Amino acid sequence: GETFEFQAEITQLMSLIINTVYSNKEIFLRELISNASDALDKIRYQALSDPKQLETEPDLFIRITPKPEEKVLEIRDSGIGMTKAELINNLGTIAKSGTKAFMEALSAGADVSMIGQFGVGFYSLFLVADRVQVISKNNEDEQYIWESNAGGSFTVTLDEVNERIGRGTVLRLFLKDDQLEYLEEKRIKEVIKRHSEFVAYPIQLLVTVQELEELNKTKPLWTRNPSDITQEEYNAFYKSISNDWEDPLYVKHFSVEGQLEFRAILFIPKRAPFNNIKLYVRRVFITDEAEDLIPEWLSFVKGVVDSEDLPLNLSREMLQQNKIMKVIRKNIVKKLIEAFNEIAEDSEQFDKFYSAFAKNIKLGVHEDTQNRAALAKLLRYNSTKSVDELTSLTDYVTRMPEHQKNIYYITGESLKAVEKSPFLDALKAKNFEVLFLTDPIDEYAFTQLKEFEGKTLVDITKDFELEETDEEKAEREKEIKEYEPLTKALKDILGDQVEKVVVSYKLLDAPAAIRTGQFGWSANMERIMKAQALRSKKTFEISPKSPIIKELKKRVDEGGAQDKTVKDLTNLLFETALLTSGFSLEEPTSFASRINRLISLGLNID
Amino acid sequence: GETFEFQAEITQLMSLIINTVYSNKEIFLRELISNASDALDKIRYQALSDPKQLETEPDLFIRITPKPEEKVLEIRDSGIGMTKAELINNLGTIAKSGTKAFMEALSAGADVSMIGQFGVGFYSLFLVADRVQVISKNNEDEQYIWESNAGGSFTVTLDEVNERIGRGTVLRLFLKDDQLEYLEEKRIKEVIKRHSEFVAYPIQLLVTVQELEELNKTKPLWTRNPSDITQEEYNAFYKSISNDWEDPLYVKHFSVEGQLEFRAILFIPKRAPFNNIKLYVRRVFITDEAEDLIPEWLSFVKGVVDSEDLPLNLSREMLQQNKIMKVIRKNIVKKLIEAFNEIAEDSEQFDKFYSAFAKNIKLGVHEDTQNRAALAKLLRYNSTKSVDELTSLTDYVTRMPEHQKNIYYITGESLKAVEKSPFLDALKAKNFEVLFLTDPIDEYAFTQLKEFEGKTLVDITKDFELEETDEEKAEREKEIKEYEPLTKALKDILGDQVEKVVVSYKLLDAPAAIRTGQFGWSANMERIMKAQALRSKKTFEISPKSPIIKELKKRVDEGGAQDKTVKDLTNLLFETALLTSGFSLEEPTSFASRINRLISLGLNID
Numbered sequence A, B: 001g002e003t004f005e006f007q008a009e010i011t012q013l014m015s016l017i018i019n020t021v022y023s024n025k026e027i028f029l030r031e032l033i034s035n036a037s038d039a040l041d042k043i044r045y046q047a048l049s050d051p052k053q054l055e056t057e058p059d060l061f062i063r064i065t066p067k068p069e070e071k072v073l074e075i076r077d078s079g080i081g082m083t084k085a086e087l088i089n090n091l092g093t094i095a096k097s098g099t100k101a102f103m104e105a106l107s108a109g110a111d112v113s114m115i116g117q118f119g120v121g122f123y124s125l126f127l128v129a130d131r132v133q134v135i136s137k138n139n140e141d142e143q144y145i146w147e148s149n150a151g152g153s154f155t156v157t158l159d160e161v162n163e164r165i166g167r168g169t170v171l172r173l174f175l176k177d178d179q180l181e182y183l184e185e186k187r188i189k190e191v192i193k194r195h196s197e198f199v200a201y202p203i204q205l206l207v208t209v210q211e212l213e214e215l216n217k218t219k220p221l222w223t224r225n226p227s228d229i230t231q232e233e234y235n236a237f238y239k240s241i242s243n244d245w246e247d248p249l250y251v252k253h254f255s256v257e258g259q260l261e262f263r264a265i266l267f268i269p270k271r272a273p274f275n276n277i278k279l280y281v282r283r284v285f286i287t288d289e290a291e292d293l294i295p296e297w298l299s300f301v302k303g304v305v306d307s308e309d310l311p312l313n314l315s316r317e318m319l320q321q322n323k324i325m326k327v328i329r330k331n332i333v334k335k336l337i338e339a340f341n342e343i344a345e346d347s348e349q350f351d352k353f354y355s356a357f358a359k360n361i362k363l364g365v366h367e368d369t370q371n372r373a374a375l376a377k378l379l380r381y382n383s384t385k386s387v388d389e390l391t392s393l394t395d396y397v398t399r400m401p402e403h404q405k406n407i408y409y410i411t412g413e414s415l416k417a418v419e420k421s422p423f424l425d426a427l428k429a430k431n432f433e434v435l436f437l438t439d440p441i442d443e444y445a446f447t448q449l450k451e452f453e454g455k456t457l458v459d460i461t462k463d464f465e466l467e468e469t470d471e472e473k474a475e476r477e478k479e480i481k482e483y484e485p486l487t488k489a490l491k492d493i494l495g496d497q498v499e500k501v502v503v504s505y506k507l508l509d510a511p512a513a514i515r516t517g518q519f520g521w522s523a524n525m526e527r528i529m530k531a532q533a534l535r536s537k538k539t540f541e542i543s544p545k546s547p548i549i550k551e552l553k554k555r556v557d558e559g560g561a562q563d564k565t566v567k568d569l570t571n572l573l574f575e576t577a578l579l580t581s582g583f584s585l586e587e588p589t590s591f592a593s594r595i596n597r598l599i600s601l602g603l604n605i606d
């Protein structure tokens, strides 16, 4: 049948590209600098084969001159420029990107990496300007003026009233009556620092005597190998990408080659606030709101990532959904894990790294599952054998005897409450080391690990059993069977406050304590859960080697299982053991009342 | 001078709209259903003036008949259809939207609201298909076939081998090999539920026996009159917009007819979800990730918002930054405040609502400032006179005596620990009501309020002054200096644990108590801060009329300022006051050992 070619309504496509493509109206400056950088890259590539191309204009720069008295923001560069034909075919045709044609026409293997590849970015200037007066000048042509008012047609006339420029393009922007904000120095500097910070060419800005100030003093470091970059340059780079005042603690500069090519310079700060990783394609900032490239627990680091094969959208403000995001996320996680392992080789630097980002590492163990074993070796806690220095789990399993098959730890509110806990005497009598956990997020990660190099993590606050000789077990069972009336009477006294009352030999000096029941929340977990602003079973055991329990035993033998004088004593002892174990004290008024009664008894007053 | 018209490269403009824009590949179905809905709206408006237009096909529907045998996802509708000239200019031209041409040619007082306003949405089908065969049929022309290969030209041939449809368009989408996922019923139903759920015209889908199933069974309610909607319809609408299984508690259906006309049906769930509010433009879901649309503390509210004059971008997945979302946020906040006030008029309804979203309201008092006084009326807490039922702040200040100027409250870990706290007897003697704060987020709101109807919020756990008579102030000053040597000796024993020790008359039944101070954190605030997963000063007081303090007074009169038996009592009583006030002990081992010493002394243990 009949065949027709596709057409495009210019009077509607122009408004479609200008108004309904870009969300913000400040990226017009970023696109103009990107076009100027592409022109300078073209004239530089032409200068490598012919040095006479820079005789007219030797300096390569981009000059921006705001004029509030004339309502014009001029954009002047010293690039290759546009001839009479380029002002019609390249600049006058929508979706025509001559920068793409220049990139595909050069010989394979060039070092240049230009930015423009769509062909409609130049029309973004009309979002803040009504009429434009772009002036071009090429070495192989005269000086012309490209005038437009975002209408249906454009006018190109020979320049005979303006100054004779050497080489480059002068983009005269007549701003609208409601877009005068872009004539201020602070607004221009903010747009540059946000979108046009790491351009390879100097961005000169005319500020008020008139002077020129460069807005891109900091050069990108991802274009150089990590072998010839000093630490001060890394500190300046970190202070430039972020508003932080302190130098980065550690820098990780890697480069992945092969099917995916991308470079990233990830920095580790010196403090924690309790996204951050910027994305750069063709030396231009695209977006920083992609949460899928970096995990939430790992979002404490700062830095930028440079790439060239990312499928950028038309607006150049973000990227499409692709499978490369998972690849770059895995690479960043692996490189940061390697960086953490390198920091672990040092003692002074890793101390600051752990004291500043312990929560992030412990979160990495809690949520993440693939790198859980790698992050478990970075945990540092105190123990009975290490009171001052922090000891890892790798050094913990080395000091474990041949008969110990489990890793013992303990949680609590503070370090002073767990260092003198009544659950440590039994483990120290057997020369068993017990770790110390003082942060509320420690148990959230220890409940996910449940194993380290084959050693099961056992919490001493919960119920647990220890191996012993058959003779000791036979003697302990014959002692437990005779304390049975005491535990039975004490259970009836406590009522439903505890699950059961059994004799425990894991207490030497403490008279009694309350443990957990191997399941549910522990003594510290329920305290953390009942204290969150945005958001189990207990067992009472006594020690048969304490004089207090020995005196309580002879009370039920004479018929004192239901006396009124003993009830006050056993209830107060239960609430005291409840406090020393880490549980929540319900109704402290009766506790204080009984305490005051003993005070009166000790002060000889009734 | 030389004037030239703007041009557009077809081979590049097409590629611009095939990879850059429409970052998601599943929205091709949404756009095609929107085009079918526009065609049906056209034929429905044409039927209002000529009923004979629907004689060829009376039914109005969109049929989705997948065919995995030949890898085609054909979409058939019964809209107005396109003629021979419409398949060239309306469909074959980029950025040409005949739907906009039909909208601008509408009569005065039209009611139809069509979706098509750009003209590039039809070309989104090439994201998953390599070639299309659009079969159109209009009442004023013959049945033609519009074929394309996503290249630079298209072919239009007269239909001779396909079905002789009555009226509408048939779009044969030959899906690519890597995009065969859209041939299953699950993917089609998910895309329809995500974007094309609330289309006014029925969407038919062939599920393979060949049977048809309507996907858009839930009709929208924002177009109908809110006063005519029943509760079951609101429940069914809530079950469709959200995956929740519980019925909505309260529904707020309002419509603002100001400078920006928009409809919104906000629902109140029954459980806290710890975005949620979806945005619709002309019965089309665009996005649900709007930040400025709803505050953070208000994210628990579910519902949808329908607007018409919104700056839709090219991809129709976000709004442009035109500073128009602030008025929508303000209207939503105001309407939900009115909704909460209406819920407060009912007893059982507000009891069910406050029991599920108390933290959300308290967080709203914490961060929000413009509606802080409005949200303060919804705060419900217990008190000494309201131990059973909840009481607001208005009912609290109405029962305040004429000589009370401050609102007294108390915070603690639980309600049983604050109902008998020794800080209540001082206010109970003056017949002053004291609120009970049992949640960790209550102080974060009470610190931001600081006042309610001129009454200053004063925490009784902190240092505060009570009004007294000169006859009582005289005897208080006479007895304060009498106890001064006891306080000096007690401070010398306590050391740096407390700042100062003052004889406070705000204690009647307790021998002593400890407070934080006048400024800074409270007793429970520092405990919550030290118990958070992502994350002081003390003033000691005594009661001069207690037998314990009266006996301790005579101890220092005989030279007992530095005895060995008084320091044990001093430390023990200090930790007891530290317990009853809501703090945490420095070490429970020392407290447990001291209590065990009392037990040995009481049990005559030598």
Ligand SMILES: Nc1ncnc2c1ncn2[C@@H]1O[C@H](COP(=O)(O)OP(=O)(O)NP(=O)(O)O)[C@@H](O)[C@H]1O
Pocket (backbone or CB within 6 Å): A031, A034, A035, A036, A039, A077, A079, A080, A081, A082, A090, A091, A096, A097, A098, A099, A100, A115, A116, A117, A118, A119, A120, A121, A122, A123, A168, A169
């Ligand atoms: N300042 C300039 N100096 C010289 N040539 C320029 C300048 N600005 C634009 N051009 C030319 O005009 C063409 C049109 O560019 P433009 O419409 O901005 O889109 P693009 O830069 O080519 N691709 P993109 O940046 O992704 O939108 C460029 O390819 C250059 O050849």
Ligand SMILES: Nc1ncnc2c1ncn2[C@@H]1O[C@H](COP(=O)(O)OP(=O)(O)NP(=O)(O)O)[C@@H](O)[C@H]1O
Pocket (backbone or CB within 6 Å): B034, B035, B036, B038, B039, B077, B079, B080, B081, B082, B090, B091, B096, B097, B098, B099, B100, B115, B116, B117, B118, B119, B120, B121, B122, B123, B168, B169
């Ligand atoms: N199924 C259809 N039946 C009849 N006419 C149709 C159909 N699909 C598209 N058209 C016509 O083709 C035109 C092109 O529409 P399209 O390219 O999809 O963008 P649009 O819908 O007009 N505007 P937008 O939805 O914002 O992209 C429409 O305006 C209709 O006039």
Ligand SMILES: [Mg+2]
Pocket (backbone or CB within 6 Å): A031, A034, A035, A116, A119, A120, A121, A122
């Ligand atoms: Mg450009």
Ligand SMILES: [Mg+2]
Pocket (backbone or CB within 6 Å): B031, B034, B035, B116, B119, B120, B121, B122
């Ligand atoms: Mg469309």
